[PDB]
Amino acid sequence: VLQLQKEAQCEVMQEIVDQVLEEDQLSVLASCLQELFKAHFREVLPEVGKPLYLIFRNLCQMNSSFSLLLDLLSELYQKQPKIGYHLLYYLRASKAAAGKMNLYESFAQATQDLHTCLMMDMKACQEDDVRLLCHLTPSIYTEFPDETLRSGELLNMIVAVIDSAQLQELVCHVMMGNLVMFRKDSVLNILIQSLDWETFEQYCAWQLFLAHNIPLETIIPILQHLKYKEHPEALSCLLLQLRREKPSEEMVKMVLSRPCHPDDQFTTSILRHWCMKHDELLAEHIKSLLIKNNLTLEQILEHLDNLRLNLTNTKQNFFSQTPILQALQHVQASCDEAHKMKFSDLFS
Amino acid sequence: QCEVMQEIVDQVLEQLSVLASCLQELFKAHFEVLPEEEESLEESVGKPLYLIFRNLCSLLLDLLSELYQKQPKIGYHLLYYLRASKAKMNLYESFAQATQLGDLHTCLMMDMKACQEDDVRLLCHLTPSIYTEFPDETLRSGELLNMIVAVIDSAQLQELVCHVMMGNLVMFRKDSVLNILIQSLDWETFEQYCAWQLFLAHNIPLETIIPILQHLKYKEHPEALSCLLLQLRREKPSEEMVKMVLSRPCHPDDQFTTSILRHWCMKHDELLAEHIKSLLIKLTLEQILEHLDNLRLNLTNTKQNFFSQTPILQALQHVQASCDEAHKMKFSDLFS
Amino acid sequence: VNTELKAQIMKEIRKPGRKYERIFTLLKHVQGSLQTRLIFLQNVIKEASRFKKRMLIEQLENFLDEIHRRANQI
């Protein structure tokens, strides 16, 4: 009787009676409101007072009534999954939900866990309402760091549907201290995952990483995963950012660990920049790495021969430096004769 | 090799326009210009049409000129030849001066546009030598850059970036790069992205192009503003940098100034405080106070005491008297 | 006509996001014989793969298969 009556005001003032009567089998009620609240799951964000949100309202204001309404929400969520992000939006838009994001967790606990339903609801929101996903991302990352920070799937969802404007909005959110998408202990695995994504997705992932306060030294092992035919997006971004670094010995080692391919100019690019800006430090690092490996010897020597051939188009002195001359003389003997001949101009 | 031996006889015999149309019909076959791999390029340039270029390497030029009128793709076919044959580009100068307009820059632009439409790989392989041998006709604006960034993919973008960083490619000069980026503000999103990546490859000081902050609108130029924010966050602010950051008008959704000011204040607190003190004491005063109030609101989510530094405090104390009462109350919480 | 639709489709392919609706709308206007439309779809697929947009390619290949079948029937 109280559902076959189900203007907006009459409807919410009746939904309240529905809840009050529930407060003293709920699957069939869930099915009937599932049918009656279609055409409300359509946009969601404006450019709040609907009858379904009333339930949320009660749950924010209400012990065993709490669990009762949570089971009702669970049944409807089983019948209508979109409810999920509609809850999140509510917890961000309503003044009644001030300081009650916790509700979602308990909602996720009462469903037929938190991480699962959050991933599913964010995926549904990405499929249904990109604007709502963009506007929810900061609060979802801030309130659920242990469920989002180690998640490459959420970042994939986000970077798949955003344009340049929404990317800029996320970047400003990060730089204003309102959004954290990466942590130092998980960002490397996430970017290794990223290397499988679409082009613009990888560009967005790297632009987002650059907005954070994570040193490149944290993710520099990813160089061992970058293939020059397959990952030009990541190689581009990582090269343009490695430009600005004072190179560690580990960074030079990771750069020299890329396989030698004549069509790949990444290593010569970054080594040229570093030798032009930090000649003595780079020479020290190269000497140390040459003596430590005595990454193979011949790989290092071929990279340095490529750099030597390249440096003839600009006046410089990099190979006249004592450390690398000492290293070349120290290390010539470990090559075989074929490689002693291959690098004869370098060993001179 | 048969029709090549015949073509040398055709060229050795000396109207040539009807002959030019005959050669068009006969050379329809080779109209990918590049091979899949040294000997590749020599076998590529061993075809008939290239023997006339080989002979040219004045009456031959009018045959070419008449050949050009009928077959326009001849232009980039010449360029490729002059880069693929040991047999540099002065022949292209002479050939472009024979056209109806005779303007080398325009003939170069038309041939590069035809090549962009007909083969992106050839355009990408020709770009370094075209910029190196014709810098003057290529560097002074971004028409050719616009052609290139309109069709390249991520692989070709990384290759061009590597060509720049290795000293084999120059696409901007410091005297023209600012206007080129300003006109690029009208390009497609990926075009602007690639243009900015190439600029970054050139390692031209950010100070050179930082005046572009007066043209960047937050709602219309998110690519340029994104790249510029990510680049500025790595610089020690230089007073003029902060001056142009503060010269952006405040709009409810524009967050660029606040983000960059927050980064700078959180890792260059004293230097940024000094810059803002000098700018306050010398873009209007209330716009600076407005950006400062936005920053003060933002800093309540953190614990940094940037506004406890005495340069900022004393500058505010000194300059409060030069605001009218409406702005004294508009910025009350800041002046306090 | 087809060249303008191609220019607009290429503009759409070189944008981030997954707003494929305009691509499909412009494709539904490709004129000419069925082989012309097959070549058009092939070029669009080539560009989309230049940007590694794989599920867009899946959909475009569904389109290509249906056009192939209708051409085989005609």
Author numbering:
A (entry chain B): 583 to 588, 593 to 610, 615 to 632, 634 to 638, 649 to 663, 667 to 716, 719 to 900, 919 to 972
B (entry chain A): 595 to 608, 615 to 631, 634 to 639, 642 to 661, 671 to 700, 704 to 898, 919 to 972
C (entry chain C): 808 to 881
Question: Could you share sentences copied from the article?
Answer:
To clarify the molecular mechanism underlying the assembly of the INTS3/INTS6 complex in DSB repair, we crystallized and determined the crystal structure of the INTS3c (residues 560–905, 915–995)/INTS6c (residues 800–887) complex. The structure of the INTS3c/INTS6c complex reveals an all α-helical assembly resembling the shape of a “butterfly”, with the INTS3c dimer forming the wings and one INTS6c subunit near the two-fold axis of the dimer interface making the body of the butterfly. The molar ratio between INTS3c and INTS6c is 2:1. Two INTS3c protomers form a symmetrical dimer wherein two protomers are related by a non-crystallographic two-fold axis. Analysis of the dimer interface using Protein Interfaces, Surfaces, and Assemblies webserver (PISA)22 revealed a buried surface area of ~3400.0 Å2. The bulk of the hydrophobic core consists of Leu773, Phe806, Tyr809, and Leu846 from both chains of the dimer. The core of the interface is hydrophobic in nature with Pro823 and Phe858 of INTS6c juxtaposed against Phe806 from the two subunits of INTS3c.
SOSS1 consists of three subunits: INTS3, SOSSC, and hSSB1, with INTS3 serving as a scaffold to stabilize this complex. Moreover, the integrator complex subunit 6 (INTS6) participates in the DNA damage response through direct binding to INTS3, but how INTS3 interacts with INTS6, thereby impacting DSB repair, is not clear. In response to DSBs, INTS6 is recruited to DSBs by directly interacting with INTS3c.
